Design a protein around this nucleic acid. Structure first.
Ligand SMILES: [Mg+2]
Ligand SMILES: [Mg+2]
Ligand SMILES: [Mg+2]
Ligand SMILES: [Mg+2]
Ligand SMILES: [Mg+2]
Ligand SMILES: [Mg+2]
Ligand SMILES: [Mg+2]
Ligand SMILES: [Mg+2]
Ligand SMILES: [Mg+2]
Ligand SMILES: [Mg+2]
Ligand SMILES: [Mg+2]
Ligand SMILES: [Mg+2]
Ligand SMILES: [Mg+2]
Ligand SMILES: [Mg+2]
Ligand SMILES: [Mg+2]
Ligand SMILES: [Mg+2]
Ligand SMILES: [Mg+2]
Ligand SMILES: [Mg+2]
Ligand SMILES: [Mg+2]
Ligand SMILES: [Mg+2]
Ligand SMILES: [Mg+2]
Ligand SMILES: [Mg+2]
Ligand SMILES: [Mg+2]
Ligand SMILES: [Mg+2]
Ligand SMILES: [Mg+2]
Ligand SMILES: [Mg+2]
Ligand SMILES: [Mg+2]
Ligand SMILES: [Mg+2]
Ligand SMILES: [Mg+2]
Ligand SMILES: [Mg+2]
Ligand SMILES: [Mg+2]
Ligand SMILES: [Mg+2]
Ligand SMILES: [Zn+2]
Lengths: 169, 98, 91, 200
RNA sequence: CCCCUGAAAAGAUAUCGGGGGUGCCCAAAGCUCGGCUCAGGCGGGUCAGAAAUCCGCCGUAGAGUGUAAGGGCAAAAGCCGGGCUGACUGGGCCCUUGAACGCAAGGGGCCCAGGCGGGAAACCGGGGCCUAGAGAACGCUCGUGCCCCCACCAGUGGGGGCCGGGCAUGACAGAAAAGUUACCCUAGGAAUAACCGGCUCGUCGCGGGUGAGAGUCCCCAUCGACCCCGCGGUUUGGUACCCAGACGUCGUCUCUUCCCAUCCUGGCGGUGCAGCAGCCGCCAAGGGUGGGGCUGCCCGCCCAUUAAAGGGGAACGUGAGAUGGGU
RNA sequence: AGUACUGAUCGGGGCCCCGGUCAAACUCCGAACCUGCCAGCGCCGUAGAAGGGGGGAGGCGGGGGCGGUGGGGUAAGCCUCCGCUCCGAGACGGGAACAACCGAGACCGGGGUUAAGGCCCCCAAGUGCGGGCUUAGUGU
RNA sequence: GCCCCUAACCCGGCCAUAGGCGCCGGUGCUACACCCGGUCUCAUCAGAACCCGGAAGUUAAGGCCGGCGCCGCGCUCGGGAGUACUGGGCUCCGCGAGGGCCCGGGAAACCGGCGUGCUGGGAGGGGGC
């Protein structure tokens, strides 16, 4: 895959209508809510931590997934699934394109260079704004250090600067 | 590709109607008797599109010049050229601004 | 498309609607005494290349459907075209 | 009804009194409309001019006006329809109307109907109303000979059924077998009244 | 040619921009009048069933409307039935194609006259609910007119003319048209490629953050999944700014210099450093980095040594210095 | 902006309800803004508006800056649209040089005052003034 | 004749403040209805409907009027909010995509509040000329 800097910047309109996009990729993220998802048991949790974007840009689906695994694995190992709720708040609706000569992908992909330069689908990304909430964690106040560490580890995998915001529910 | 030019070639928004505007329209616009010299506004009715003027005349103010059977002859301007729109009253409204 | 073999149609000579029989149009044979044909044979005589263009590439798939309506009362003939489509079936 | 995307129909359409397609075709004429309406008891005849903010009724009358000329027949039979049409036509001619277009609304245009009886009365008063030659009822039905023949047969066959079915005629003092002559007298009265008014 | 989007709420608007369609089809899928209401759901009902015909309740259109897309449409523009042929004859004006602003064909609208169809009437009908299905000159053919002309006059046969329909150019504002040149020739072009140069860095090389996991235990001695941030200009690519009256195109030889992201030589540290060895990091470019076999090679592999037998830049250094194996 | 039509999309709760994420080819709402007619102001105009006729063209390769996340593209001193301005066809001051960045529009000669920008020297004008930060020659 | 006032009826305009569901009332001389029949005009499988002829019955329903609750809808109402967005200027910040300052405009969702048809012509009825 290309470096994420190639697709970090928002440079055009959103590309999301899958009934018009040919060969649109599937969303590979297997689940979006972690931990104790039922609201009856979330009533125990009183602290809210939020990993929040600082700049405007695009996060790739693989980057979101890697942050999700690192944060969820840390939270399971050190807080236990019965003591937290973790939600990846954004969905990668945007479809990324790449212009490259390749295999059987249309007769217009066999012409080299910038001739017929509209690329084929290459992945998915979530277009985010400043102050947008990327990760949302509900937790009991005793696990604040572990939750902040999990959010830091998740933030290490993302292409844009972020911050952690802690507050009461 | 260069722009195609049908008689209604960029008229999706102009010919769309809101859900509260659906169906037949009121008949009061039929009952305005315009005399020569009256000022009218070309406001296209989408339910009678086959008799409606071109989209370029929407919102333009014209002067009634005469009557042809049941239509009205309206002298208007597109930029600086004088154009003649012969249209029935259902696409016209009286101009109240003088 | 199917078209009737007889219609009720206005006749300009009768100045009224009469019954018209319906037939397909058939072009007449080119007569050798036509002025253009005479000029063409004159041009064909003598040495030289082929003197006139002859179309090689054709694009039409159908011809314009042409029909003759004959007034049964007076024999006045009206030839009309129904547009470019496949050949009609008289029924 | 349910949701913002529901389009409520026009008030007169949802009350079921105006066919707006037919109304638009009538309004294209640009002529006055002879509106004829039927009820269970009376007949309404109006000469209407349509305006952008509301129709203007030049003349309007139901069949209660025939009592002014001494009608003792039914309120809404064919003879009553004709007399109402005559009065409305004379009033419209007084007010300046010389042509009109028949407007029957949701009623059916069956031949010999009371709406065409009203139209025939209006035509005889002196107002031109276009119509086919096969819809106006016969002069026998306009005079009311059908009512008289029914009353005669009912009196011959079942007298108690005759009294029950024509009680109001007998209260009024006109037996239904004398309907044509009384129609003739009332028509003479109306014609003389409005013709003297027109001369003066 | 046509629809949506691009298109930035008047108009106009491009790219080998995105999603699609067109070269038809229909005597009914055309005209009109009337009646009715669709998809779907629910209750009851012989065969009968998920689905047949029947009774009723709900049902904003979730149906249908020939055909793309968009728009329109419910006592209808849909469905059924009745009657029909206006998919009519002769003309005019206007809109669009073609913005303001010149300019074909085609298409649409409003009408006047003739004569009709449906309808009580109003009213509608010059094809298809609307926006696509479209063709000059010359020639030929057909229709039409008590029509006009053909050379001193009349006649006969024949020819031509005006008006209208068709026969076609799809490269669709209209030549009738296959290759090859490395044997090649001309006029030009950096309006336009190949080399170097410029811009860019996807690719390539290099560095860093993170720490699942491995490491007997032990994330970080040594690695570093899933991801992310960068640098160089050392490969390849993109673009086409300069250079076609010409900057000599690979490799090698010869000779000089520069960089450091260091292979050895100097200094230091860590180690899963007992010694011998090995691995990892930092400073450091003064010096060294060789001889052969294979391929034109660059590269690569191999041989015997060696402290080690590093990698790059200099118009891919250096053909007015050579060589000429390759191209 | 919304997620109500057409679509996607994460959770909870009981086909519906609630919260959540989206739409160039979705839209109940909806600006700034642009645009038609009328009246006025402003300005231009009888030393001649609108409108029309005639002769002669050049040109029909454009480019730079800024703005439409314009559309495309990894990006490009890249391709292709929209608008103002400037270069081309425009002198001159500043920017270290420099067509289009800032200032500014040049008949000739002289006097003065300012614009951009600058005032330790090169170099005209300040080793100017108050407070605070930096130890890296960071930076200028 | 003409002027004024005014229910239910007729012809309309705007086309949900007018629609939907549920509950409680009022209205009946006249008017609107349900209603009673099918000889005639006309109509179908069916006098159900349409069409015709009536007046025994009833306000049960429709229609019209008044009240309440919910859903939907509306508003030039308060908040949201001078927020989002935006026309013009800038040697103003940021590595950059971008953001900032000044002059001028300025929403939407949603929350609360209020409202839940208004109106033109005619008939009929009442009061004057
Ligand atoms: Mg862009
Ligand atoms: Mg064009
Ligand atoms: Mg049409
Ligand atoms: Mg526009
Ligand atoms: Mg079509
Ligand atoms: Mg119909
Ligand atoms: Mg054209
Ligand atoms: Mg033009
Ligand atoms: Mg066309
Ligand atoms: Mg002679
Ligand atoms: Mg051409
Ligand atoms: Mg060039
Ligand atoms: Mg090159
Ligand atoms: Mg060179
Ligand atoms: Mg790489
Ligand atoms: Mg680490
Ligand atoms: Mg290169
Ligand atoms: Mg050069
Ligand atoms: Mg040279
Ligand atoms: Mg040289
Ligand atoms: Mg040379
Ligand atoms: Mg070093
Ligand atoms: Mg070289
Ligand atoms: Mg040489
Ligand atoms: Mg040399
Ligand atoms: Mg050789
Ligand atoms: Mg949003
Ligand atoms: Mg605009
Ligand atoms: Mg050009
Ligand atoms: Mg430009
Ligand atoms: Mg300078
Ligand atoms: Mg000085
Ligand atoms: Zn004839």
């Amino acid at each position: 895959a290309r470096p994420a800097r190639c697709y970090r910047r928002i440079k055009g309109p959103p590309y999301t209508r899958e009934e018009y996009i040919h060969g649109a990729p599937m969303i590979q993220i297997p689940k979006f809510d972690m931990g104790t998802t039922s609201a009856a048991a979330r009533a125990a949790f009183t602290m809210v931590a939020k990993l929040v974007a600082e700049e405007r840009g695009q996060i790739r689906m693989q980057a979101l997934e890697a942050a999700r695994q690192i944060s969820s694995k840390y939270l399971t190992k050190y807080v236990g699934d019965a003591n937290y709720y973790l939600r990846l708040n954004v969905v990668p609706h945007h479809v990324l394109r790449e212009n490259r000569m390749l295999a059987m992908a249309g007769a217009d992909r066999l012409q080299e260079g910038m001739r017929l330069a509209f690329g084929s689908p290459a992945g998915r990304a979530a277009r985010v704004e400043p102050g947008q909430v990327i990760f949302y964690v509900e937790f009991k106040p005793e696990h604040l250090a572990h939750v902040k560490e999990a959010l830091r580890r998740a933030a290490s995998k993302l292409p844009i600067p972020t911050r952690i915001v802690v507050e009461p529910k | 590709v260069k722009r195609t030019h049908g008689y209604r070639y960029k008229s999706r928004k102009l010919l769309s109607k809101a859900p509260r505007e659906r169906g037949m329209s009121g008949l009061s616009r039929l009952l305005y008797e315009y005399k020569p010299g009256d000022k009218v506004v070309i406001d296209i009715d989408p339910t009678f599109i086959s008799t409606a003027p071109h989209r370029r005349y929407q919102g333009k103010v014209g002067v009634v010049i005469g009557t042809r059977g049941r239509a009205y002859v309206i002298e208007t301007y597109i930029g600086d050229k004088k154009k003649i729109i012969i249209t029935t009253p259902e696409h016209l409204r009286p101009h109240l601004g003088g | 498309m199917k078209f009737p073999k007889s219609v009720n149609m206005y006749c300009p000579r009768c100045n009224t609607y009469t019954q018209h029989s319906v037939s397909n149009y058939h072009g007449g044979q080119r007569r050798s005494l036509a002025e253009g044909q005479r000029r063409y044979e004159r041009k064909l005589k003598g040495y030289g290349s082929t003197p006139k263009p002859k179309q090689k590439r054709f694009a039409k798939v159908n011809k314009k459907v042409t029909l003759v309506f004959t007034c049964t009362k007076c024999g006045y003939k009206i030839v009309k075209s129904l547009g470019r489509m496949k050949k009609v079936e008289l029924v | 009804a349910r949701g913002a995307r529901y389009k409520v129909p026009f008030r007169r359409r949802r009350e079921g009194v105006t066919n707006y397609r037919k109304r638009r075709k009538l309004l294209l004429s640009r002529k006055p409309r002879l509106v004829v309406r039927k009820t269970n008891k009376h007949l309404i005849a109006q000469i209407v001019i349509a305006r952008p903010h509301g129709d203007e009724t030049v003349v309007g009358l139901d069949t209660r006006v025939l009592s002014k000329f001494g009608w003792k027949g039914d309120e809404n039979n064919t003879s009553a329809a004709y007399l109402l049409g005559l009065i409305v036509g004379y009033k419209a001619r007084a007010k300046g109307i010389k042509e009109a277009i028949l407007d029957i609304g949701l009623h059916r245009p069956t031949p010999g109907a009371r709406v065409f009886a009203v139209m025939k009365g209006v035509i005889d008063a002196g107002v031109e109303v276009p119509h086919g030659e096969e819809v106006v009822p016969s002069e026998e039905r306009i005079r009311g000979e059908h009512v008289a023949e029914y009353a005669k047969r009912l009196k011959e066959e079942a007298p108690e059924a005759y009294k029950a079915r024509f009680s109001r005629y007998l209260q009024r003092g006109l037996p239904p077998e004398e309907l044509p002559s009384h129609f003739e007298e009332v028509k003479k009265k109306i014609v003389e009244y409005y013709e003297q008014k027109l001369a003066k």
